[PDB]
Amino acid sequence: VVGGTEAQRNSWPSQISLQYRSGSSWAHTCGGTLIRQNWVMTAAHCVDRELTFRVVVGEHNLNQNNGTEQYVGVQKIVVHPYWNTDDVAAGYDIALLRLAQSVTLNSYVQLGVLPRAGTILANNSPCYITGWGLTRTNGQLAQTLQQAYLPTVDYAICSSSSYWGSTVKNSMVCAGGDGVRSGCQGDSGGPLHCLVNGQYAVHGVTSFVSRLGCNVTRKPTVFTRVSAYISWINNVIASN
Ligand SMILES: C[C@H](NC(=O)[C@H](CCCC[NH3+])NC(=O)C(F)(F)F)C(=O)Nc1ccc(C(F)(F)F)cc1
DSSP states (O other): OBTOEEOOTTSOTTEEEEEEEETTEEEEEEEEEEEETTEEEEOGGGGOSOOOEEEEESOSBTTSOOSOOEEEEEEEEEEOTTOOTTOGGGOOOOEEEEESSOOOOSSSSOOOOOOOTTOOOOTTOOEEEEESSBSSTTOOBOSBOEEEEOOEEOHHHHTSTTTTGGGSOTTEEEEOOBSSSBOOTTOTTOEEEEEETTEEEEEEEEEEOBTTBSSBBTBOEEEEEGGGSHHHHHHHHHTO
C-alpha cells in the first residue's frame, strides 16, 4: 500500500498472503481474503501463471516468525469463466482457491464478511486497503501488513473523462485517488474493507492501478466489486 501505516496483528484477520515457490523458498505475490476454513478469494490476474502457491493465514511480518501463521497449500484453483488476462478492464478479475486443508480460526485467523449481493456504496464511504504491496511506486514490498484509508469514489465520478473514463465498469469499486495513498503491485487480490452497519465487509478485490504509477491524483485504485459475484461465489463453494 502507498501512503499506509502499520496495522496491529489482530486488526484484519481475514487477510491472507498468496505466495509462490520461488526455488528454495516462497515469495509474496498477492493478497486474498479467507472466506471459508478451506476457501480463499483473490484476483484472477494473481493465479494467471501456473506456479506452486501457498496461502499464509494469520500473517503480519513476512520475513519473521510471528508464532501465529498457518501455511496451507492450494488443491484447486477456480477462476471466473469470463476472466480475460489481456483485458483486466473487462472486469471479472476474481478467483477462488480451495485449500489443501481447513485452517484453524482464532483471533488472528477469521473469515471475511461478504456484502449482500447487489450493494453499492455511497461516494466517500470509509474503507481501508490492506496489504504487503509496494510502499512507493517502483518501491519494495512492505515487511509488515499496511493499511490505508481509501474512501470510495462512486461510478458517475470514476468513469468521468477526468478520472478513469470507460476503463472502469460498474462491476468495479474505485477508492482513493488523492495522489498520496493507494494500492500497489503486490496488493492485487487483497481486501478493501468498508464500514457498513457497524461491520467491516470485504467490498473489493484489488484489481489494478494506473500504468503511470500507484498514487496518481484522479486515478483511484480499482477493485472488483464482490457484491456483484455473490451468487457465483456461492455456486462454486456449493459444487465443491
Ligand atoms: C502497472 C499496472 N499493474 C496492475 O495494475 C496490476 C493488474 C495487472 C493486469 C495486467 N496483466 N495490478 C495491481 O497492480 C493492483 F495492485 F493494482 F491491483 C498496470 O499494468 N495496470 C493497468 C493495465 C491496463 C489498464 C487498461 F487496460 F485498463 F487500460 C489499466 C491498468
